[PDB]
C-alpha cells in the first residue's frame, strides 16, 4: 500500500532518556556510539545557540551515515528545517558554485513569523468606474477612481480605490456577483468565485461557488508562517509581488539564479533582527546534510572554512565514503576522506563501524517486515550468509524479487528456493566482475 | 509508421508463471534474462517499491536494447517509460544533476481523476457582446434539444472558442466543461440564409435527444515533471514544448511533493510508478553516478533500467578503472541481469522473424547463407543485408531473394573485419593517425 | 508534402455597403444585417453577400472602393493586397504600390 524508499524502517535515533542507546528502537541495529554522538548533536541543535558547528560521518559503505542524517532529521522534527544535499549539486551552469553553497546555507536557517494582514473581502454588488478628464493625453490613466460595493454578512462598505488597485481588480477579471478578497498588504486580490446567492446552474466555466464571507469587511487577520532566510533573499533579489511595473514585469520573465550580493543579506538580517526585537520573530537554526563530500573540489572547501566562521551559519553535517584519497581539484594533496587538512581542524569526526552477521540478519528481518513480506528462518539465515559474503545492500535489494517469485508460485511464503532463484537470475558485483574477467567479448 | 531495428518485438514472450516461451511475442533466446526482465516488469506492475536499480550486462549485438524495449511494450499504455541515452545529460543550460532530476521527474506519473460535464444540443441563439477594442467579452448562448432548452452564460474562453471554428445558429455542438473543447458535429436546421462567403457547410446530423447535461468522469495522466514546470513560472506550458525550462528551484519540488501526496490521500490522484531507461550508461560521469546513487533513496523514484556493453573500463572523469565503467558503490546498489551470445538456431530464428517483419520472401539456402554470414561476422550485418538483397532482387524482377543476390550484396557492401583488412593492406592511401598520406599513384 | 484545396474570392472591390436592417435594436449607431461587396477581376465580376462579421475586418484593414483584395471562404478574413493599378488617381504623390488587376476568374478553387 505504502511505498518503501529504503529508509522507511527508520523512525528516529532510538535513544533512551539519559543518552544511552537501546539495541533495538526506531529500526536501528547497532551503531551505539554513533547513535549517542548523533543524539548529542540533536541536543546541540535544540540548544539553538551555536553557529557553524560541523561534523563528518566517516565510514565505509553499507554502514549508516545517510541513515544517521535522516535519523537526525526525524528526531529534530519538521519545524526546524533540514536541507539534504549531494556534493554534485554544488556545480551549476548558471551561477558560481560558492553562491549555490551560500544559498543552501541560508536555505537551512529557518524563521518563525506571525503577521497581521488587513483584508477586504465581500460580494461585489456595485462596480462603477469614474472616467478621466483628458483620456487621450496618456500621461495619466484613463480613469481616476473606481467605486466598488462590497457586501458580506453583518457589514457593508463602499470602496473608492486608486486606479493601481483597479489594475489587479481587472486582471483577476472581477465581475459583478462574485466574492473577492483584497489583501491590503501588497495590493494583491484573489477572486474566490461566483456568489451562491444567485443561480449557480447555468455557467459553462466550471466555476466554484462560495457562500457570503462571515464577519465584517476590513477584517484584520493574524496568520503564522514558516519561511527560510534564502526565500527572503530570493524574494528581495527578484522582486515579484508589488503592483508596480517592475514587479508585474518581473513575474513574466524566466528567473535565473543570480549572485546574491552580501549587502542584501545584511539588510535582510537587519530587518529580521528588527522583527526579533519587536517580538513576532523567533529564529530556528537548522541542519544541512552534504552527502558525498568527496565529490566537492578544493574551491568549495576553501570557501567553506570561511563560510562556517560567520555569526549566522547553520550546523552542517557531512558524509564521506572514501579513505586515504587525493582531493579533487588538486593533484598533490593526499588527505583523509577526501577532505583537506585545513577543513579537518574545524571538523568533529564521528566514526561509524561495519556490521556483524547477526546485525545484518536483524536488518534483513526488519526490512522484510517493513516491506510486508514474511520470511522463513532458513531463508533469512541464507540471506544473512549472502549479506556477509557479498554485501548487505545486495541482500537488501534481493528481498523484493524473491517476494515476486513467491507470488508467482501461488504462496505467501519465502523459501530457500526463491532465494536460489534470485541468485540465479540476478548477480552481485563480484560474480559480474569475474564474468567480465573470464570473457573476452568485453562483456 | 516505419520499420525499424526493433519493429518485431511486441512483448517479453512470457507465460503467466513467469517462464519464457521458446519463441513468442516476437522474441527468441535469452531465457534467464527474459525471466529476470519479467520479474522486474511484475515489480513495476505492483508499483510499491521505489528506486530499484537494474543493470543489464553483455557483449554488443546480444539483445539488451531489445530486452528493454520489450519491457516497454509489455509494460502497457499510460505508464511512463523514459528512454534517455547517456550523452543527452551534458547540457549547456541545465546542470547534470538537474538533467538527471528532470529525467527522474519525467519517469513518474500521476493519474488525475477529474469530474466533467458534457452538453450537446441544437444551438438556438448567440448574443456575444464585445467591447469597442474587443478585449473584454461576455455573451449568452442558447441551446436546445428535442426535450428541453436552457440558457447559459458565456465567458472569455468559450466565446473565443465559438469564434474560431465559427458556429452559427442551426449547428449541433458538444461542449466539455472541464476542458473547454468545442466540437461542431454538424448543421441540423439547414437555415434558408446562405451567405456567399460560407463554402464549407458541415454535414447534416440529426438533432440530439435526451437531456443536455450528462455527468461524466474522466482520468488523464500527467507526469511529475510536467506539473513541476507548469507551477514553475507564469508561462510554464510553453516550456514543455520549447524546453526552455531550467535550473528549477527545490522549493517548487518540495511543495509539489506535498501537494501530490495531498491529492493522493483525498483520492484525486493515483500515482503509477514508471521506468527510466538509460541506454549506454557507461557514457555518464562520476558526478552523475554520485547523484544516481543518492537519488534512488526517495519515495518518488522509479525503477531505473541501465545498460552497458563494456568490460573492465575507465570510469569517466576519474583515473581508475572499474567493472562495467560503473563505480563500486553504484554497482553494489544495482542488481545485474546478464546476457550471453547466441548460436546458429537462435540467429536463424532472429533473421527469420526479421525477414517476416521486412516483407522479404527469402529462399531457404539464402537463409542458410545469411546464418553462416551472421555467425561468421555479426548479427547486425546479416540483419542489414536482407533489405539490400531484396532491392537487388527487385532490380532483377524476381520476388524471391536468391543466393546470387546475397553474394552480390556481400561483395558490394563490406562488414567490419573485411574493411579492417582492406585498410591494413594499403594503409598509405588513407590518412594516418599521424596525419600522413600519399595521394598520388606514383 | 500536403495537398488541399483553396476556395477563395479574389478581385478588385468596386462597391462595399454596410447594409442596414429593419428593427435596429436600440441605442446603437448601426445595425448591419449583411455586407454586400462587389468584386471585379479579369473577365469576371461578382456581388458577394457576406456575413456581418467581415465588416470590422474590412473597416480595420482600410478596405475602400478602388482596392484589390483577397479573401477566404471558410475563414472570411479579408487581406488587402493594395489599390488597383488603374486607380492611381493621386498622380502627384503616392505611397501605396499599385498591384495590377488580378488575372483569372473572380472565384478560384486551386489545389
Amino acid at each position: 500500500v505504502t511505498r518503501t524508499a529504503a529508509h522507511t524502517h527508520i523512525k528516529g535515533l532510538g535513544l533512551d532518556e539519559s543518552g544511552v542507546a537501546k539495541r533495538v528502537e526506531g529500526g536501528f541495529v547497532g551503531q551505539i556510539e554513533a547513535r549517542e554522538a548523533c543524539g548529542v548533536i540533536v541536543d546541540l541543535i535544540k540548544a539553538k545557540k551555536m553557529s557553524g558547528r560541523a561534523i563528518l560521518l566517516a565510514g565505509g559503505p553499507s554502514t549508516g551515515k545517510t541513515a544517521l542524517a535522516l535519523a537526525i532529521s526525524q528526531e529534530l522534527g519538521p519545524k526546524v528545517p533540514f536541507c539534504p544535499l549531494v556534493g554534485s549539486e554544488l556545480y551549476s551552469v548558471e551561477v558560481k558554485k560558492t553562491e549555490t553553497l551560500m544559498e543552501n546555507f541560508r536555505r537551512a536557517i529557518g524563521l518563525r513569523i506571525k503577521e497581521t494582514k488587513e483584508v477586504y473581502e465581500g460580494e461585489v454588488t456595485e462596480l462603477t468606474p469614474e472616467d478621466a478628464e483628458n483620456p487621450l493625453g496618456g500621461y495619466g490613466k484613463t480613469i481616476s477612481h473606481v467605486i466598488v460595493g462590497l457586501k458580506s454578512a453583518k457589514g457593508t462598505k463602499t470602496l473608492r480605490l486608486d486606479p493601481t488597485i483597479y489594475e489587479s481588480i481587472q486582471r483577476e477579471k472581477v465581475s459583478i456577483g462574485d466574492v473577492i478578497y483584497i489583501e491590503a498588504n501588497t495590493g494583491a486580490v484573489k477572486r474566490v468565485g461566483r456568489s451562491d446567492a444567485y443561480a449557480t446552474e447555468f455557467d459553462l466555466e466550471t466555476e466554484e461557488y462560495v457562500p457570503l464571507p462571515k464577519g465584517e469587511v476590513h477584517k484584520k487577520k493574524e496568520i503564522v508562517q514558516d519561511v527560510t532566510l534564502h526565500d527572503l533573499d530570493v524574494a528581495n533579489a527578484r522582486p515579484q509581488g508589488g503592483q508596480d511595473v517592475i514587479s508585474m514585469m518581473g513575474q513574466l520573465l524566466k528567473p535565473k539564479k543570480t549572485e546574491i550580493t552580501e549587502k542584501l543579506r545584511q539588510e535582510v538580517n537587519k530587518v529580521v533582527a528588527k522583527y526579533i526585537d519587536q517580538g513576532v520573530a523567533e529564529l530556528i537554526p537548522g541542519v544541512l546534510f552534504i552527502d558525498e563530500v568527496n565529490m566537492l573540489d578544493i574551491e568549495i572547501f576553501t570557501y567553506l572554512n570561511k563560510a562556517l566562521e560567520s555569526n549566522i551559519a547553520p550546523v552542517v553535517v557531512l558524509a564521506s565514503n572514501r579513505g586515504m584519497t587525493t582531493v579533487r581539484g588538486t593533484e598533490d594533496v593526499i588527505s583523509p576522506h577526501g577532505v583537506p587538512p585545513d577543513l579537518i581542524d574545524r571538523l568533529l569526526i564521528v566514526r561509524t563501524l561495519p556490521y556483524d552477521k547477526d546485525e545484518i540478519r536483524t536488518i534483513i528481518e526488519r526490512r522484510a517486515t517493513v516491506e510486508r513480506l514474511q520470511v522463513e528462518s532458513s531463508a533469512l539465515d541464507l540471506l544473512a550468509t549472502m549479506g556477509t559474503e557479498t554485501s548487505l545492500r545486495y541482500a537488501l535489494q534481493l528481498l523484493a524479487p524473491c517476494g515476486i517469485l513467491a507470488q508467482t508460485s501461488n504462496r505467501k511464503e519465502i523459501v530457500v528456493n526463491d532465494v536460489n532463484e534470485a541468485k540465479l537470475l540476478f548477480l552481485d558485483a563480484k560474480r559480474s566482475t569475474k564474468i567480465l574477467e573470464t570473457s573476452a567479448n568485453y562483456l | 509508421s516505419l520499420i525499424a531495428a526493433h519493429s518485431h518485438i511486441t512483448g517479453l514472450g512470457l507465460d503467466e508463471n513467469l517462464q519464457p516461451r521458446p519463441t513468442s511475442e516476437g522474441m527468441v533466446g535469452q531465457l534467464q534474462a527474459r525471466r529476470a526482465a519479467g520479474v522486474i516488469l511484475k515489480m513495476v506492475q505492483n508499483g510499491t517499491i521505489a528506486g530499484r536499480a537494474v543493470l543489464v550486462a553483455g557483449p554488443p549485438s546480444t539483445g539488451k536494447t531489445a530486452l528493454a524495449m520489450g519491457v516497454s511494450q509489455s509494460l502497457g499504455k499510460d505508464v511512463p517509460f523514459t528512454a534517455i541515452a547517456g550523452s543527452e545529460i551534458f547540457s549547456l543550460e541545465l546542470s547534470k544533476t538537474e538533467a538527471l532530476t528532470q529525467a527522474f521527474r519525467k519517469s513518474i506519473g500521476i493519474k488525475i481523476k477529474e469530474e466533467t460535464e458534457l452538453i450537446e444540443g441544437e444551438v438556438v441563439e448567440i448574443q456575444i457582446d464585445r467591447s469597442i477594442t474587443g478585449g473584454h467579452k461576455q455573451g449568452k448562448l442558447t441551446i436546445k434539444t428535442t426535450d428541453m432548452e436552457t440558457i447559459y452564460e458565456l465567458g472569455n474562453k468559450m466565446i473565443d472558442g465559438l469564434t474560431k471554428e465559427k458556429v452559427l445558429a442551426g449547428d449541433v455542438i458538444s461542449i466539455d466543461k472541464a476542458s473547454g473543447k468545442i466540437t461542431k458535429l454538424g448543421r441540423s436546421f439547414a437555415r434558408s440564409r446562405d451567405y456567399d462567403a460560407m463554402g464549407a457547410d458541415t454535414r447534416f446530423v440529426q438533432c440530439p435527444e435526451g437531456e443536455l447535461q450528462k455527468r461524466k468522469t474522466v482520468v488523464h495522466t500527467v507526469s511529475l515533471h510536467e506539473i513541476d514546470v507548469i507551477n514553475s513560472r507564469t508561462q510554464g506550458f510553453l516550456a514543455l514544448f520549447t524546453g526552455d525550462t531550467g535550473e528549477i528551484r527545490s522549493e517548487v519540488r518540495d511543495q509539489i511533493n506535498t501537494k501530490v501526496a495531498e491529492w493522493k490521500e483525498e483520492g484525486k490522484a493515483e500515482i503509477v510508478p514508471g521506468v527510466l531507461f538509460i541506454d549506454e550508461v557507461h557514457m555518464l560521469d562520476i558526478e552523475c553516478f554520485s547523484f544516481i546513487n543518492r537519488a534512488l533513496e526517495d519515495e518518488f523514484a522509479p525503477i531505473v533500467m541501465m545498460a552497458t556493453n563494456r568490460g573492465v573500463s575507465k570510469t569517466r572523469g576519474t583515473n581508475y578503472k572499474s567493472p562495467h565503467g560503473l563505480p563500486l558503490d553504484l554497482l553494489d546498489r544495482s542488481i545485474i541481469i546478464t546476457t550471453k551470445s547466441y548460436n546458429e538456431q537462435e540467429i536463424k530464428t532472429i533473421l527469420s522473424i526479421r525477414a517476416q517483419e521486412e516483407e522479404v520472401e527469402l529462399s531457404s539456402d539464402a537463409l542458410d547463407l545469411l546464418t553462416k554470414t551472421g555467425v561468421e561476422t555479426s548479427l547486425r550485418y546479416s540483419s542489414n543485408l536482407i533489405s539490400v538483397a531484396q532491392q537487388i532482387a527487385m532490380k532483377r524482377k524476381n520476388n524471391t531473394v536468391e543466393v546470387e543476390d546475397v553474394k552480390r550484396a556481400y561483395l558490394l557492401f563490406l562488414d567490419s573485419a573485411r574493411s579492417v583488412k582492406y585498410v591494413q593492406e594499403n594503409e598509405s592511401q588513407y590518412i594516418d593517425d599521424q596525419g600522413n598520406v600519399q595521394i598520388s599513384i606514383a | 508534402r500536403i495537398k488541399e484545396t483553396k476556395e477563395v474570392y479574389e478581385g478588385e472591390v468596386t462597391e462595399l455597403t454596410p447594409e442596414d436592417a429593419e428593427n435596429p435594436l436600440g441605442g446603437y449607431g448601426k445595425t448591419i444585417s449583411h455586407v454586400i461587396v462587389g468584386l471585379k477581376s479579369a473577365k469576371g465580376t461578382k456581388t458577394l453577400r457576406l456575413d456581418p462579421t467581415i465588416y470590422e475586418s474590412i473597416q480595420r484593414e482600410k478596405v475602400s472602393i478602388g482596392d484589390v483584395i483577397y479573401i477566404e471562404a471558410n475563414t472570411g478574413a479579408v487581406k488587402r493586397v493594395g489599390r488597383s493599378d488603374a486607380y492611381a488617381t493621386e498622380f502627384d504623390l503616392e505611397t501605396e504600390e499599385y498591384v495590377p488587376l488580378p488575372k483569372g476568374e473572380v472565384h478560384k478553387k486551386k489545389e
Partner: peptide, 28 residues
C-alpha cells in the same frame, strides 16, 4: 425558492446577434 439569475451588465458594448433566420451586428 429558485435563486434569481445573475445580473447581466452589457452596457457600453457592441452586439453580435445570430438567430435562426438571419444574423445581426450592432455597433458604434
Amino acid at each position: 425558492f429558485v435563486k434569481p439569475r445573475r445580473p447581466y451588465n452589457s452596457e457600453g458594448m457592441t452586439r453580435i446577434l445570430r438567430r435562426y433566420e438571419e444574423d445581426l451586428f450592432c455597433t458604434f
